[PDB]
């Protein structure tokens, strides 16, 4: 019983460890999302500006 | 060269001239350099912890960018200006967030708009508490997230819609909302083990409703009832409406304590439980 | 002949509470990684449609000199 | 988690080629511009054998997303710099109209 | 009789829950007149109307026994249609009822003279629609029953 | 909010330049602007959720960008035009989505082709059930993903193939996929545990075989007996197969009797329970 208790207690604090990981994860998941959206407009308006460029020097 | 000097030095060059200073062109080459002065200025106002001429400078950095040809990055700078007043003490981030969605939607970029359509709902629910309008942004933003097919984004928004239907006390609409989404979770093995809880939300949202919708929506949910979270989900509910339709608050309020011992209840659940707890007492005595 | 039954009750409901705790931290965890999981689907557009802007543009910038 | 950590490969696919385009597109701008108890004793051990499944996958599932955090350590700066490079190259790619 | 969509509501008070009458508003129908509630093709249930001043026009109020016979609750869409009985072979001349106390925390052994109960029964439930197996509650000397 | 007059005034603007309309330079700036005009024209229908009309209005702007010399964003405009009838119920998102992959592959490219090719497959399986076509779409898409070394989606699109191709009729292509993924999965530290159920699925697929083909893979398989997870790999099969050979269909139910409790059973395996007892009763009666 007591061996099994301790063996469960291992997974207990390991669960708390994986939550101690999610404290970093959620931050990473947020900040990658912060740039993911941001890059598409810089890319589309760059394609636009390049459209203005390429029409002058046919 | 301070942030305060950049505003007045850009004020020199913002002038719309028609003279030998102009020639033939206007100030179309000049409205960008003005926006550049403000692009540096709005940056360094925050560096001086201004936070209020910061946000106004983030506004001015895009305000003049409108008149060039380009609302797009001007719109990104409106979102940035909303990140100024939002973090700061005052509002008027909410204004620039209107200024943003009215532009990105005006191209079809609903997702970028929806990044902060939700944040508008966040301010209008947390700060400027306008829960009918906040929910009009959660539900509407959910409609946009389904516009680009992202089901779980809209399930996140619609749980703000329906989660606060309990505090908005619209239990008849809450039961209208948690059903289709849990059915969208029986299909998903990625999402199933919260689906029982999703229909528990649809189940528990009673206004003292003794429809067997409460006893049938759980039946709809395909369910091996000796499963391992169902003892804490479904037969729970059957026990609780066993006592409501008993006209007995005694065992109704014993099993709630029986259940909190095995899964600690939260504000939303506990409020809904004591909401229905008043419903038995509202008929036994009177 | 009853105290060991009381341990058989108590130490094992404690054990079941360890189960309850890890199962509840895991109905946290499964949902943690669940809710994070769709952000990747949010990237799913911005990862290659972003490339759809970048390469399809610089194929023109290199042709914009011409 | 497996499939979402393996999506990180296509994340790499996007960022390397965008970064490739920005080292080359850099060039065009300047080029153009300028007994049940005794059964219980077995059931509790049946679960003591199960907690092996628990602890093994627990210890294992820890390390992967740490490795993914390092993969994100690749992503973050090569994304932020690329966000800077697109905007400077774009403003240059708009000022050369004339 | 063409049938109008109605919203199932809850009986206002205890008096009409002792009438077994599909409690309605005076704005729509008339007390005494009989109707047939339709929930589905395989469910047709017949009820007596008894108007009341606290019913919403466009919603019908039902008591707990009748809902526990009708399978109904607060705020469901139903189709209510006027139903006119045939007084050739449907007027009740002999009706058995299985009776029992409703609430099990007031059970006694006292005798209740059935001739008085059946007489007060007809004095209260006259011109009412009763189907086989229909369940309701009877008030005899301030006592709840399950009929 | 002028949807009409844009469409009519761009009629002389959707106009090549050989006329008085031509003048000095081409009309490749006029039609270029007109693309944005029709995009915005569809945008202001789309905002009012007129997606049926909106998609047809995006087909204009998406068609005209090709005309100048630009497959570049014209395919993005086809993706946009397909989002209309994708989000809206009716069809012909199918068309623009088939337009986009052919255009991306005609750019000299591979990824985004497969990325929307499975979108087409999702439509043609989930909506327009055309499994004989959408399964081929997953096949070709997985082929491109092998050509990108994202074996990620090479394995995923093939699991989508074989999970349905199995119950349909085809158990050999199935195990081909499920052995391919299990063998490529013992390689990675990320993949080797998904390989358990993969070799399980690779084992399950029977051509009504009364032999050990499942247990054949087991006699190959890396069960690692101290690892109990492969009791959900073979111990099921270990118990039920002897039953199947030795006249014990009645015993066959008692396996799922508990395995549905220790693993809630989905559609595929439950239908397979019925299917491999179709193999029983095709040994007995059928």
mmCIF file of C-alpha atoms in Angstrom, chain D:
data_model
loop_
_atom_site.group_PDB
_atom_site.id
_atom_site.type_symbol
_atom_site.label_atom_id
_atom_site.label_comp_id
_atom_site.label_asym_id
_atom_site.label_seq_id
_atom_site.Cartn_x
_atom_site.Cartn_y
_atom_site.Cartn_z
ATOM 1 C CA UNK D 1 0.880 16.786 -29.524
ATOM 2 C CA UNK D 2 2.857 14.605 -31.874
ATOM 3 C CA UNK D 3 1.244 16.046 -34.963
ATOM 4 C CA UNK D 4 1.415 19.605 -33.642
ATOM 5 C CA UNK D 5 5.079 19.223 -32.759
ATOM 6 C CA UNK D 6 5.631 17.767 -36.212
ATOM 7 C CA UNK D 7 3.915 20.780 -37.770
ATOM 8 C CA UNK D 8 6.977 22.585 -36.423
ATOM 9 C CA UNK D 9 8.816 21.091 -39.391
ATOM 10 C CA UNK D 10 6.650 23.055 -41.793
ATOM 11 C CA UNK D 11 7.122 26.080 -39.575
ATOM 12 C CA UNK D 12 10.829 25.598 -40.226
ATOM 13 C CA UNK D 13 9.945 25.209 -43.914
ATOM 14 C CA UNK D 14 8.334 28.593 -44.025
ATOM 15 C CA UNK D 15 10.860 30.502 -41.987
ATOM 16 C CA UNK D 16 14.000 29.285 -43.730
ATOM 17 C CA UNK D 17 12.746 30.119 -47.203
ATOM 18 C CA UNK D 18 11.343 33.486 -46.130
ATOM 19 C CA UNK D 19 14.725 34.189 -44.567
ATOM 20 C CA UNK D 20 16.254 33.030 -47.854
ATOM 21 C CA UNK D 21 14.087 35.427 -49.795
ATOM 22 C CA UNK D 22 15.099 38.310 -47.541
ATOM 23 C CA UNK D 23 18.825 37.763 -48.093
ATOM 24 C CA UNK D 24 18.287 37.863 -51.879
ATOM 25 C CA UNK D 25 15.470 40.409 -52.035
ATOM 26 C CA UNK D 26 17.917 42.519 -50.028
ATOM 27 C CA UNK D 27 19.892 42.749 -53.281
ATOM 28 C CA UNK D 28 17.249 43.942 -55.746
ATOM 29 C CA UNK D 29 16.489 47.078 -53.742
ATOM 30 C CA UNK D 30 20.014 48.486 -54.005
ATOM 31 C CA UNK D 31 20.467 47.071 -57.507
ATOM 32 C CA UNK D 32 17.491 48.976 -58.910
ATOM 33 C CA UNK D 33 17.860 52.006 -56.634
ATOM 34 C CA UNK D 34 21.534 52.878 -57.014
ATOM 35 C CA UNK D 35 -12.120 -12.606 -0.304
ATOM 36 C CA UNK D 36 -12.843 -9.447 -2.290
ATOM 37 C CA UNK D 37 -10.126 -7.940 -0.090
ATOM 38 C CA UNK D 38 -7.793 -10.605 -1.501
ATOM 39 C CA UNK D 39 -9.045 -9.704 -4.967
ATOM 40 C CA UNK D 40 -8.475 -6.082 -3.953
ATOM 41 C CA UNK D 41 -4.888 -6.951 -3.120
ATOM 42 C CA UNK D 42 -4.563 -7.867 -6.794
ATOM 43 C CA UNK D 43 -6.620 -4.960 -8.124
ATOM 44 C CA UNK D 44 -4.546 -2.401 -6.292
ATOM 45 C CA UNK D 45 -1.502 -4.106 -7.782
ATOM 46 C CA UNK D 46 -3.149 -4.198 -11.186
ATOM 47 C CA UNK D 47 -3.154 -0.459 -10.823
ATOM 48 C CA UNK D 48 0.319 -0.474 -9.332
ATOM 49 C CA UNK D 49 1.318 -2.023 -12.664
ATOM 50 C CA UNK D 50 -0.694 0.645 -14.453
ATOM 51 C CA UNK D 51 1.073 3.491 -12.674
ATOM 52 C CA UNK D 52 4.082 2.224 -14.552
ATOM 53 C CA UNK D 53 2.250 3.375 -17.672
ATOM 54 C CA UNK D 54 1.563 6.608 -15.894
ATOM 55 C CA UNK D 55 5.060 7.391 -14.707
ATOM 56 C CA UNK D 56 6.776 6.213 -17.868
ATOM 57 C CA UNK D 57 4.677 8.323 -20.200
ATOM 58 C CA UNK D 58 4.772 11.125 -17.643
ATOM 59 C CA UNK D 59 8.547 11.280 -17.534
ATOM 60 C CA UNK D 60 8.602 10.868 -21.288
ATOM 61 C CA UNK D 61 5.961 13.465 -22.166
ATOM 62 C CA UNK D 62 7.827 16.038 -20.117
ATOM 63 C CA UNK D 63 10.862 16.234 -22.325
ATOM 64 C CA UNK D 64 9.258 16.665 -25.745
ATOM 65 C CA UNK D 65 7.701 20.044 -25.300
ATOM 66 C CA UNK D 66 10.906 21.250 -23.660
ATOM 67 C CA UNK D 67 12.560 20.222 -26.907
ATOM 68 C CA UNK D 68 9.778 22.130 -28.616
ATOM 69 C CA UNK D 69 10.600 25.132 -26.462
ATOM 70 C CA UNK D 70 14.095 24.975 -27.886
ATOM 71 C CA UNK D 71 12.543 24.685 -31.335
ATOM 72 C CA UNK D 72 10.638 27.826 -30.406
ATOM 73 C CA UNK D 73 13.936 29.298 -29.302
ATOM 74 C CA UNK D 74 14.834 28.878 -32.943
ATOM 75 C CA UNK D 75 11.563 30.446 -34.055
ATOM 76 C CA UNK D 76 11.391 33.564 -31.930
ATOM 77 C CA UNK D 77 14.413 35.628 -32.920
ATOM 78 C CA UNK D 78 14.478 34.397 -36.532
ATOM 79 C CA UNK D 79 10.868 35.604 -36.621
ATOM 80 C CA UNK D 80 11.351 38.945 -34.876
ATOM 81 C CA UNK D 81 14.354 39.869 -36.988
ATOM 82 C CA UNK D 82 12.457 38.780 -40.087
ATOM 83 C CA UNK D 83 9.535 40.980 -38.994
ATOM 84 C CA UNK D 84 12.033 43.834 -38.849
ATOM 85 C CA UNK D 85 13.640 42.972 -42.183
ATOM 86 C CA UNK D 86 10.349 42.789 -44.047
ATOM 87 C CA UNK D 87 9.318 46.195 -42.835
ATOM 88 C CA UNK D 88 12.606 47.940 -43.585
ATOM 89 C CA UNK D 89 12.915 46.235 -46.984
ATOM 90 C CA UNK D 90 9.308 47.162 -47.686
ATOM 91 C CA UNK D 91 9.691 50.810 -46.805
ATOM 92 C CA UNK D 92 12.756 50.864 -49.047
ATOM 93 C CA UNK D 93 10.680 48.999 -51.658
ATOM 94 C CA UNK D 94 8.153 51.840 -51.558
ATOM 95 C CA UNK D 95 10.537 54.847 -51.482
ATOM 96 C CA UNK D 96 12.108 53.951 -54.864
ATOM 97 C CA UNK D 97 9.090 54.960 -56.974
ATOM 98 C CA UNK D 98 10.523 57.789 -59.029
#
